[PDB]
Symmetry: D2
């Protein structure tokens, strides 16, 4: 995994974020197991609860671009600093990357199982 | 607008739907005012209420791909027939295409304002 | 026909005061008459992750079921000033599930059936 | 709790689970939470034809917390269709954090635990 490449891509996509309500743009980029990179940015709505996270966008692109499994994900905030996925995104990411999906963190990447232990699941 | 081409693109992307819980795959394709076509398919979750609609995916792609406005959207279901967006998606689409956004229907498109009148805003 | 809209609005305004809406600054309340004669209420509950926000009308549906089920007959949604609000598209779909097309939604110009607000619904 | 009455919360969660609106999954869920004013609030899941518009039992708990007069959540039990303890989904972990904080105790068959253990390094303010 080229983490510097992922962060660069997440910063690039964050410039397109639609976040006029919070003023808090977010970019995300992930490496897929087929070797391609997908990206996403947050898209807010006037009804706050219909807002889509950057990580949600990533998962949508994973599938629209032909499917696969996520291997690694970086999310970056307004200043370029690495951000932690919200709990909804942690659950959504788990479905498409599993516990071993690597998630970037301001203090170093780590597996999703560490960030969503004992997850709700199909079992 | 080439509606036939939007419908075919919608069917094509629906093939990648992640809908193992409902078994109801959905695809959507939209023309953007910059001339791009963007696509999306539904992605369900084990926690049902975390599922994402195809139309949400379209709006994500709109912005990750540089922004713009939606001009036309076609949504298709399992039999390839045209579907109306759910209420959430009607609200989400309004933000990015306005009331004039054209929504595919079997006998011709109609504006989104007809599908979501007096819209919260 | 027997719906007391003034009373339902008053319940919505009352519950609005308990809203958790620190990010928008805009509290919303909703109240609904159920076919068992009770009034259920709900207020918006926003979240730091904006897209995890719950609308007042969603809260009404939760209360409907936690309190024993039923069907919604009429619903009023308001801001703090008591001004009537239109449910957002998500809430129109959620409300359809529990009230159907004939559920009455409060509106300045007279209540409107949900089917007028969400035609040809998914 | 260590002295929280988990059996009382579990019983209330099972009670409320009977009223779940889950015809799509056939997976009814109930949840009950102690508030810091000593009352219990409950909720059950409410699914939708558009699957992504489904509301979790724990969401319903948080709604009732506020509509019922506010407060902070102290302890929460979620139970599944068999009456056994269930882990909240990640969305619910995030929502619950807003209304109980990191020290909110979540029921777990191995011993209840703070929400921070289940959502470490949470996205927040
Ligand atoms: Zn998120
Ligand atoms: Zn939808
Ligand atoms: Zn709403
Ligand atoms: Zn949940």
């Amino acid at each position: 995994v080229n983490w510097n490449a992922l962060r660069s891509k997440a910063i690039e996509v964050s410039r397109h974020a639609y976040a006029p309500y919070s003023g808090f743009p977010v970019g995300a980029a992930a490496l897929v197991d087929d070797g391609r990179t997908v990206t996403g940015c947050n898209v807010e709505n006037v009804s706050y609860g219909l807002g889509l996270c950057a990580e949600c966008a990533v998962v949508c692109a994973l599938h629209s671009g032909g499917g696969g499994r996520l291997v690694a994900l970086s999310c970056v905030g307004p200043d370029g600093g690495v951000l932690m996925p919200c709990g909804r995104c942690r659950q959504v990411l788990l479905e498409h990357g599993g516990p071993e999906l690597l998630i970037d963190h301001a203090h170093g990447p780590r597996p999703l199982r560490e960030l969503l232990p004992d997850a709700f699941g199909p079992d």
